[PDB]
């Protein structure tokens, strides 16, 4: 019976602080409407005024579903701004109230609570740990763990998935371990869904859980998900390639055994398309991913070789963008540092020398040194075959010596020393 669209913040406060049930609802919805426009939700105002612990009390009203809905929405939108704003919501005691709301028989209310808990947890690790500490995980999973999720609207599923993802998201600290153990089985299952937003959200969640110590990598790999990650990595028609790749790249920063789960699940067969993908970001992340594989054991470098990936790295090292070329360098250096003499010979056959040397004119010190170390590594294989003299002439006759000599008049002492060592040892 009123113009809730055109109430003022003042009107709201009087409305809320009233003892009349209908004006309370009316106020709460006027609030909701203001927070729902684009042009500057008066968020600070609402807090200033001391409404949050009233809204929080409204969440408690089982008697009045509409007032639960209206405050949930209102709080959600507060909680979707700054840390201070989000904090006001938390300071108000929203969290345990929202968790109680998760079990409402009204789906629209439950899902509003889910959405709010997503934002609280999305702030960072502290509020995320608070949401987990207050007991959010069991009820969230109960909504998704099911014989009947099929009965959930896709918007809801996506909403839950995104919230779960936020619960898996930051570090310093990473999430509690037993919460992750509890959640992972749902994630693994959601990785077989067909909705592209569910898939992307759960893949990014897996990606976060795989970004840290070996211990974390290990709990993910043990679920048996990695073959599924590789099937997604192959879905070149979908945007899901990116998160699946992130998660696979993360897995191969772990133990040799963890890296070997990726290889055995059959990931390397996908890489020819990943390194030729026109989307340059995918090139980079696949080249980064490669470089941690060529940093692995000799039988692992050999699988990279057997799948024909080495001419692809050379290709990338030669003709891709500088960011992706950096990663190419890392793959080469790790390869030369861990590889057998044969493996190194084959790399030289694939035309590694010139593109590798081209990148010595790079204005990045860390990368000049790893190029020099890789060359140095190639010369040691040449020592063992007595071909150092051959390798020297060739490097001289393709401009390589110019680029190494160039480096003696460089400012960094290390670059100067490493390059001088090469000139001495092999070009004197």
């Amino acid at each position: 019976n009123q113009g809730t669209v055109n109430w003022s913040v003042d009107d709201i406060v009087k409305g809320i602080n009233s003892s009349n049930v209908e004006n309370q609802l009316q106020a709460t919805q006027a609030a909701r409407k203001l927070l729902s426009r684009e042009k500057q939700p008066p968020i600070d105002n609402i807090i200033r005024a001391g409404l949050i612990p009233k809204f929080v009390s409204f969440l408690g009203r089982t008697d009045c579903s509409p007032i639960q809905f209206e405050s949930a929405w209102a709080l959600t939108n507060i909680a979707s701004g700054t840390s201070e704003q989000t904090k006001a919501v938390v300071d108000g005691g929203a969290i345990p109230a929202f968790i109680s709301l998760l079990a409402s028989p009204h789906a629209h209310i439950s899902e509003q609570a889910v959405w709010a808990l997503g934002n609280i947890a999305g702030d960072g690790s502290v509020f995320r740990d608070l949401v987990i500490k207050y007991g959010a995980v069991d009820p969230l999973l109960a909504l998704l763990a099911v014989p009947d999720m099929s009965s959930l609207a896709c918007g809801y599923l996506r909403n839950l998935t995104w919230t779960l993802s936020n619960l898996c998201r930051n570090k310093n600290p990473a999430p509690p371990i037993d919460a992750v153990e509890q959640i992972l089985p749902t994630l693994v299952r959601l990785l077989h869904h067909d909705d592209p937003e569910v898939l992307a959200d759960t893949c990014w969640a897996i990606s976060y859980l795989t970004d840290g110590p070996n211990e974390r990598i290990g709990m993910v790999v043990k679920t048996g998900v990695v073959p599924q990650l590789v099937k997604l990595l192959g879905a070149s028609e979908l945007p899901i390639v990116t998160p699946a790749l992130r998660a696979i790249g993360n897995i191969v920063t772990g133990t040799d055994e963890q890296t070997q789960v990726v290889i055995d699940a059959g990931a390397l067969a996908v890489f020819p398309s990943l390194l030729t993908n026109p989307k340059t970001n995918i090139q980079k992340e696949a080249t980064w991913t490669m470089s941690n594989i060529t940093a692995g054991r000799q039988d692992q470098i050999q699988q990279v070789v057997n799948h024909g990936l080495v001419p692809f790295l050379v290709s990338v090292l030669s003709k891709a963008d500088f960011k992706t070329q950096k990663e190419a360098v890392w793959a080469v250096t790790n390869y030369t540092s861990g590889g057998t003499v044969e493996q190194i010979v084959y790399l030289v056959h694939c035309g590694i020398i010139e593109p590798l040397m081209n990148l010595l004119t790079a204005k990045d010190t860390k990368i000049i040194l790893v190029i020099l170390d890789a060359i140095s590594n190639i010369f040691q294989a040449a020592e063992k075959l007595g071909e150092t003299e051959k390798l020297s002439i060739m490097i001289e006759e393709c401009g390589g010596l110019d680029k190494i000599e160039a480096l003696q008049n460089h400012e960094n002492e290390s670059v100067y020393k490493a390059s001088l060592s090469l000139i001495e040892k092999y070009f004197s």
Binding site: S80, W115, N119, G122, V241, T242
Partner: peptide
């Protein structure tokens, strides 16, 4: 897509 990037950390229900 738009689905290739990380999801947003915070989302507002608008409009």
């Amino acid at each position: 897509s738009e689905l290739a990037e990380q999801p947003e950390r915070k989302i507002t229900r608008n409009q």
